[PDB]
Design a protein around this ligand. Structure first.
Ligand SMILES: [Mg+2]
Ligand SMILES: [Mg+2]
Ligand SMILES: [Mg+2]
Ligand SMILES: [Mg+2]
Ligand SMILES: [Mg+2]
Ligand SMILES: [Mg+2]
Ligand SMILES: [Mg+2]
Ligand SMILES: [Mg+2]
Ligand SMILES: [Mg+2]
Ligand SMILES: [Mg+2]
Ligand SMILES: [Mg+2]
Ligand SMILES: [Mg+2]
Ligand SMILES: [Mg+2]
Ligand SMILES: [Mg+2]
Ligand SMILES: [Mg+2]
Ligand SMILES: [Mg+2]
Ligand SMILES: [Mg+2]
Ligand SMILES: [Mg+2]
Ligand SMILES: [Mg+2]
Ligand SMILES: [Mg+2]
Ligand SMILES: [Mg+2]
Ligand SMILES: [Mg+2]
Ligand SMILES: [Mg+2]
Ligand SMILES: [Mg+2]
Ligand SMILES: [Mg+2]
Ligand SMILES: [Mg+2]
Ligand SMILES: [Mg+2]
Ligand SMILES: [Mg+2]
Ligand SMILES: [Mg+2]
Ligand SMILES: [Mg+2]
Ligand SMILES: [Mg+2]
Ligand SMILES: [Mg+2]
Ligand SMILES: [Mg+2]
Ligand SMILES: [Mg+2]
Ligand SMILES: [Mg+2]
Ligand SMILES: [Mg+2]
Ligand SMILES: [Mg+2]
Ligand SMILES: [Mg+2]
Ligand SMILES: [Mg+2]
Ligand SMILES: [Mg+2]
Ligand SMILES: [Mg+2]
Ligand SMILES: [Mg+2]
Ligand SMILES: [Mg+2]
Ligand SMILES: [Mg+2]
Ligand SMILES: [Mg+2]
Ligand SMILES: [Mg+2]
Ligand SMILES: [Mg+2]
Ligand SMILES: [Mg+2]
Ligand SMILES: [Mg+2]
Ligand SMILES: [Mg+2]
Ligand SMILES: [Mg+2]
Ligand SMILES: [Mg+2]
Ligand SMILES: [Mg+2]
Ligand SMILES: [Mg+2]
Ligand SMILES: [Mg+2]
Ligand SMILES: [Mg+2]
Ligand SMILES: [Mg+2]
Ligand SMILES: [Mg+2]
Ligand SMILES: [Mg+2]
Ligand SMILES: [Mg+2]
Ligand SMILES: [Mg+2]
Ligand SMILES: [Mg+2]
Ligand SMILES: [Mg+2]
Ligand SMILES: [Mg+2]
Ligand SMILES: [Zn+2]
Lengths: 136, 97, 53, 74
RNA sequence: GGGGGGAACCUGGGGAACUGAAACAUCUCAGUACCCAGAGGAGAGGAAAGAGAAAUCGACUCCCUGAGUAGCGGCGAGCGA
RNA sequence: UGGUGUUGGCUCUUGGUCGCGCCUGCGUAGGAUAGGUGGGAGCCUGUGAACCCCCGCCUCCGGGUGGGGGGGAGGCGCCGGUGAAAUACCACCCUGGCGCGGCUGGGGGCCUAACCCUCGGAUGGGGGGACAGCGCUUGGCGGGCAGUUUGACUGGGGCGGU
RNA sequence: GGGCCUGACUGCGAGGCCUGCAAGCCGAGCAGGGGCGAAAGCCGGGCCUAGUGAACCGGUGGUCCCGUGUGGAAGGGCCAU
RNA sequence: CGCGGGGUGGAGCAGCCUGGUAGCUCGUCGGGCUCAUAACCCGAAGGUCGUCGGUUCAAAUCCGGCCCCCGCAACCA
RNA sequence: GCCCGGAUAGCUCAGGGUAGAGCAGGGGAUUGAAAAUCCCCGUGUCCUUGGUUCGAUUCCGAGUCCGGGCACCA
C-alpha cells in the first residue's frame, strides 16, 4: 500500500454511510490515478449463488452510460457479489449520481423470491481507489 | 412446604399436563393431551434468622418476601423491645406488617 | 404412483399458478414436464412447467 | 386359497324394442361391441350404448356386420 | 373474647368413581358425591383499574328474555356463555 | 439430570462463536502456488525498487507471506504465449487460519458467614459448606403403582386361514 | 408405422345406468381457448371391466371473502393440491 | 394334517432380495517333489440346478402341481 | 421429517482435477518347502436424478437404501 493510495485513504472515513448524492461528490477525489478512471459500483447480494433458481443476470443501463447507447451487464459470481461499471473520473457530480442511482434500481428489479433484503452490503469505488459505502 | 409467615403464600394445586405432537403453529397436526394429573405447587419457603433486641428470631418465609423481614426489623427499631421473649418480639414485629 | 412414478403439478409459466395435477415416471422422464395447457386465469393456452406437488 | 369373487356388474341391454326413450337414456351395458351403435345411438368410452335423440328403440341383426341398436324419432 | 351444637340453605379449602363417549386414554360424569373449615338467620356478592361499540351503559344480587344463540369440542359424545 | 431461587467472599485455568488486522486459495498447460467475479492501462519505488542472511506464519511439496536488517535504480503489468480462465493494480466478496476485543461456555482451588451436622455448656466452639437439603422449571429412567386396550368371520372356541 | 401435437382441457351438463345410504358409471350438446384434418368431423387420456380409501386434523400454492371499536395484522374461509 | 424352511458337480455349503453369469472348501483324475506314501505344488474333469407344468425373447432364480427332507404345532374337555 | 454416520475394486478403506492404500488374484527378483520381503499389474455401476462448473466421488435442488439418536404419523 504505497504513498498514493494512502492520500485517498485520508479522504474516506471508514465508519460512515454515504449517499447516492454523496458518492458523486467524493468519487472525483479518489481518482488520483494517471488516467480517466472508471467508477465501479458493487453490492453483496442477499441470495444463495448455489441455488439454481435465485440468480442475477439482466441488462441495464442508461441514462449516460459506458462512454468508452451504453448498455451494461451484471451477473453475480459464485459468491453472491454483483458489481459493475460505469461512472468515470468526471463525469461531473449530479450527473453520475443519476447514473449510479438507476443501476441500483435494476437488480432491485431481479430479486428471485430469495431471502431477505437484496442489497445487503453495497459499495462504490474507483479503479485504483478506495471504497465508499453509500445508501441504496 | 407450608405457608409463608409474611405473605400468606400457601401450597396450591395445579394440573400437570403431558402433551405429544407438533404445535399447529409449527405446521403440526395439533397437540394431544396424553395425561392430566393433580400436583401441588409450593412456596419457596426458607429460614431467615434475625437478631432483634439481642434475641434470635426465625421467620419461615417465602424467598420473594425475604426483604420484607429485615424491613419489619427496620420499623421495629423504634418500639419498646427488651425484654420480651422471642415469641412476643415475633408477635410485635408481625404487627408492623 | 410410487418412488419412480410421482405426482406433480403444472404451473402456467406466465402467471405462476398451478392449474393441473398429474403424474410421470422420473426415470423414464427425468426432465420437468413442459406442456401447453389452457390457463383459466390467463384465459388462453400457456406453457406450464413441472412443479413439485 | 379360493373364496374370492367380484361384484356383479349388472350388464345387459336396458331398453328393448318399442320402448320410448328420452335422449341420453342408456340402452346397453356391455363389454366390447356385443351390440354396435346404430341410427341415433352413440357409444361411450366403455362401449355403453345410449340414445342420441328422443325416439323408439329398435333392434337390428345384420349378420356378420353385428347386431345394432337404433333409435327412431317420433 | 374464643372453644361446642344446629334439619336444610351458604361461602371457602380439598375433591372421586361407576357412568356417557355403544371399547377407551383427552373429553364426560363434575367442581357433582363426599371430607374439612367458617358464617348467619341467611350466606355469597357489591359501588368499575367494569362492560364493549351503542361517541353507549352505569355497584351488587335474583327471576324472565337474549339462547341451546355466539362459540367450545378425540369439532366425537357432548359442553355451553 | 441441566437452569434458576435460597446463594456469599477471593482465585487459577482453559475452549467455542461472532465482529474489524493480517495472510491463506497450487490438477495438467503455462515463466508459476492462478480462490470468484467486476473495474483496469497503467501500477509501485527518494516514505528505498530487483535479489536473497534473519526471523514469524504457513506449504500442495515447487514455494508463498508478514515484521526486521542488508543495501543504493530499479522492479512489475499491458504486449504475448499456453490456457476452460491471466497475471500489475483496485473493489466487493467466498474458503480456512492468525492475533485483539464482544459474548457464551467446563475444569478447578481456597475462604466462612447463609443452609446442614454436632459439642452436660448454645448471641458461642467444633465439622461439612455455598455443595447438600428445600422451592419452581427441564429432559430421562421408571409394572414399584394406576387406568385400560388386547377385532370379526368360524358347522363350539382356540390353532389355522380369511 | 409415421407426421403434427398436449382435449391426460377450463366453465357446464339434457338425460339415464346402478342403488338402502353414501358411493360408483355413462353421457349428447352449449361457451372459452386449443390440437389434428381439405373437409365431414374427432379429441374432457389409455379396447373395456382391477390398479383403491368417507369424514376429521393439518401442510403447500392461489384467491383477497371474513378480519372481535377503526386501519392493518394474527388467524380463518373459498379454489387447487 | 396346519405353519415355516429346504432339495444345485461325489460330500458339505454360496448363488435365487434380485431372470440373462453356477461359485467356495474337500474329494476325484492327470503331472511334479520323495527311495516310497502322505502333506505340499501345478493342471483338468465333473452341475442343465428334485421332477412335471406355466410365465417370459430368456428360468437355479418368478408362479403352480407332484415327490422327498427338516423344524414347529395339534389345545378345553 | 431433524441431526450425524454410511453406499467408492473381488475384501476391507483412504479422498472440485483423480481415481490411489493394505489385502484377493496375476506376473518377476530373490533360488527357496513355507511365510516374510522388493519392483510390477489393475478390476473400480464413486447409490440414483437434475443443476452449477473447463471439469462433480466432492457443491447445490429432488429422490432411494442401511445404522445411531430425536421427533411426528390425519
Ligand atoms: Mg406440566
Ligand atoms: Mg385437542
Ligand atoms: Mg437464610
Ligand atoms: Mg423471588
Ligand atoms: Mg386357504
Ligand atoms: Mg359378489
Ligand atoms: Mg361378478
Ligand atoms: Mg369419453
Ligand atoms: Mg325388428
Ligand atoms: Mg384421591
Ligand atoms: Mg363407556
Ligand atoms: Mg370396557
Ligand atoms: Mg377416563
Ligand atoms: Mg367446593
Ligand atoms: Mg356447587
Ligand atoms: Mg360451626
Ligand atoms: Mg333477607
Ligand atoms: Mg346479607
Ligand atoms: Mg365481603
Ligand atoms: Mg371506590
Ligand atoms: Mg378449528
Ligand atoms: Mg372425531
Ligand atoms: Mg364443564
Ligand atoms: Mg430438578
Ligand atoms: Mg432469584
Ligand atoms: Mg441472585
Ligand atoms: Mg475447602
Ligand atoms: Mg445448593
Ligand atoms: Mg420427569
Ligand atoms: Mg409400561
Ligand atoms: Mg397392570
Ligand atoms: Mg373407567
Ligand atoms: Mg384397569
Ligand atoms: Mg384398535
Ligand atoms: Mg367370536
Ligand atoms: Mg358353517
Ligand atoms: Mg358341528
Ligand atoms: Mg375351530
Ligand atoms: Mg387366530
Ligand atoms: Mg386446453
Ligand atoms: Mg340425472
Ligand atoms: Mg344413486
Ligand atoms: Mg363431446
Ligand atoms: Mg370451440
Ligand atoms: Mg376445433
Ligand atoms: Mg386444415
Ligand atoms: Mg374445426
Ligand atoms: Mg391404442
Ligand atoms: Mg383443515
Ligand atoms: Mg388464505
Ligand atoms: Mg381490526
Ligand atoms: Mg375491509
Ligand atoms: Mg375449479
Ligand atoms: Mg448336495
Ligand atoms: Mg441377480
Ligand atoms: Mg494325485
Ligand atoms: Mg527298495
Ligand atoms: Mg417345483
Ligand atoms: Mg414367451
Ligand atoms: Mg421354461
Ligand atoms: Mg440361467
Ligand atoms: Mg421350465
Ligand atoms: Mg385352558
Ligand atoms: Mg382337552
Ligand atoms: Zn396463467
Amino acid at each position: 500500500h504505497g504513498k498514493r493510495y494512502r492520500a485517498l485513504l485520508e479522504k474516506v472515513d471508514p465508519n460512515k454511510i454515504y449517499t447516492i448524492d454523496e458518492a458523486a461528490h467524493l468519487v472525483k477525489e479518489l481518482a488520483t490515478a494517471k488516467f480517466d478512471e472508471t467508477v465501479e459500483v458493487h453490492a453483496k447480494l442477499g441470495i444463495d449463488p448455489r441455488r439454481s433458481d435465485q440468480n442475477v443476470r439482466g441488462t441495464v443501463s442508461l441514462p449516460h452510460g459506458l462512454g468508452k447507447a451504453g448498455r451494461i451487464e451484471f451477473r453475480n459470481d459464485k459468491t453472491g457479489a454483483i458489481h459493475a461499471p460505469v461512472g468515470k473520473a468526471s463525469f461531473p457530480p449530479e450527473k453520475l449520481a443519476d447514473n449510479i442511482r438507476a443501476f441500483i434500481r435494476a437488480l432491485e428489479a431481479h430479486k428471485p423470491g430469495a431471502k431477505g433484503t437484496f442489497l445487503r452490503s453495497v459499495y462504490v469505488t474507483t479503479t485504483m481507489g478506495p471504497s465508499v459505502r453509500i445508501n441504496p | 412446604s407450608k405457608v409463608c409467615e409474611i405473605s400468606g403464600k400457601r401450597p396450591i394445586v395445579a394440573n400437570s399436563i403431558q402433551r405429544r405432537g407438533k404445535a399447529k403453529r409449527e405446521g403440526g397436526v395439533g397437540k394431544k393431551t396424553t395425561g392430566i394429573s393433580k400436583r401441588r405447587q409450593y412456596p419457596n419457603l426458607q429460614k431467615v434468622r434475625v437478631r432483634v433486641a439481642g434475641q434470635e428470631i426465625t421467620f419461615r418465609v417465602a424467598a420473594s418476601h425475604i426483604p420484607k423481614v429485615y424491613e419489619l426489623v427496620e420499623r421495629a427499631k423504634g418500639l419498646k423491645l427488651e425484654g420480651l421473649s422471642p415469641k412476643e418480639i415475633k408477635k410485635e414485629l408481625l404487627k408492623l406488617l | 404412483a410410487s418412488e419412480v412414478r410421482i405426482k406433480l403439478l403444472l404451473e402456467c409459466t406466465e402467471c405462476k399458478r398451478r392449474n393441473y395435477a398429474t403424474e410421470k415416471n422420473k426415470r423414464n422422464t427425468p426432465n420437468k414436464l413442459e406442456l401447453r395447457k389452457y390457463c383459466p386465469w390467463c384465459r388462453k393456452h400457456t406453457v406450464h412447467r413441472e412443479v413439485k406437488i | 386359497r379360493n373364496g374370492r369373487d367380484s361384484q356383479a356388474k349388472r350388464l345387459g341391454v336396458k331398453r328393448y324394442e318399442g320402448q320410448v326413450v328420452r335422449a341420453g337414456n342408456i340402452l346397453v351395458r356391455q363389454r366390447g361391441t356385443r351390440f354396435k351403435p346404430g341410427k341415433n345411438v352413440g357409444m361411450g368410452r366403455d362401449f355403453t350404448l345410449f340414445a342420441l335423440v328422443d325416439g323408439v328403440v329398435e333392434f337390428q341383426d345384420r349378420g356378420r356386420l353385428g347386431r345394432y341398436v337404433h333409435v327412431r324419432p317420433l
